[PDB]
Amino acid sequence: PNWELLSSLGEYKDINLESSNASNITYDLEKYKNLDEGTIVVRFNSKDSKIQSLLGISNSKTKNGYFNFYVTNSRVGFELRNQKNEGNTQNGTENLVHMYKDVALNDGDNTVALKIEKNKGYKLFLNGKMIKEVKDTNTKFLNNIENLDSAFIGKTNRYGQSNEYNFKGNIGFMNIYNEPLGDDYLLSKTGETK
Ligand SMILES: CC(=O)N[C@H]1[C@H]([C@H](O)[C@H](O)CO)O[C@@](O[C@@H]2[C@@H](O)[C@H](O)O[C@H](CO)[C@@H]2O)(C(=O)O)C[C@@H]1O
Ligand SMILES: [Ca+2]
Numbered sequence: 001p002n003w004e005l006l007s008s009l010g011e012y013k014d015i016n017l018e019s020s021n022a023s024n025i026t027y028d029l030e031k032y033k034n035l036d037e038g039t040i041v042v043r044f045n046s047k048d049s050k051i052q053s054l055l056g057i058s059n060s061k062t063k064n065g066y067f068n069f070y071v072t073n074s075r076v077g078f079e080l081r082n083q084k085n086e087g088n089t090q091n092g093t094e095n096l097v098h099m100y101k102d103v104a105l106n107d108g109d110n111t112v113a114l115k116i117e118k119n120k121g122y123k124l125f126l127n128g129k130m131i132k133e134v135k136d137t138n139t140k141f142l143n144n145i146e147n148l149d150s151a152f153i154g155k156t157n158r159y160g161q162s163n164e165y166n167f168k169g170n171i172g173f174m175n176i177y178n179e180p181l182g183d184d185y186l187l188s189k190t191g192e193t194k
């Protein structure tokens with residue numbers, strides 16, 4: 001059974017992205033880069049409609065080796081991609097997971113969670129609802145991307161002129177956990193901005 005109380009692996013607060021100056025958390029990369037499962041919970045308030053990274057963990061030497069937990073004004077999701085060749089090329093790209101849900105967002109604060117349970121599947125939660133489940137008996141996550149070297153709150157650091165999905169607005173908090181938390185907890189917690 002689930003821990004009633006589990007400390008976060010990563011905890012970040014009050015991230016001002018009103019100028020899209022993304023917050024560099026590569027100092028914590030070691031704690032995430034080999035994760036096969038976990039939970040990410042984010043309270044956020046965007047001011048744009050474009051695809052924007054809540055959390056971007058990447059091999060900045062490639063265009064397409066990254067994890068991008070993102071939102072728009074009408075969608076939340078994540079992509080997980082790997083790339084075997086560095087620099088200015090599309091070569092060696094493996095598009096591993098794209099999971100998303102079209103959904104109504106609040107004008108102000110919203111709260112989203114991504115839960116990954118190793119070899120069970122992935123769940124997205126938003127504003128007190130479990131909005132999308134993808135079952136998967138052979139899951140992939142950060143451990144599957146080669147040569148990760150950057151983590152940011154508010155963008156994904158990619159090679160050259162790639163789209164970094166710069167978030168504009170503020171992120172009130174981000175908690176990352178090494179384990180998949182209970183649906184009950186995530187329904188209540190994301191439910192704070194119902
Ligand atoms: C979440 C998502 O859809 N991500 C896409 C990304 C975005 O659709 C786009 O950057 C938002 O503007 O598009 C990616 O593929 C790009 C192609 O759409 C474009 O034709 O060519 C680009 C290369 O110069 C790029 O390959 C991307 O930015 O990598 C694919 C990604 O999953
Ligand atoms: Ca907003």
Ligand SMILES: [Ca+2]
Nearest residue numbers: 136138139140
């Ligand atoms: Ca799979």
Ligand SMILES: [Ca+2]
Nearest residue numbers: 157158159160
């Ligand atoms: Ca870059």
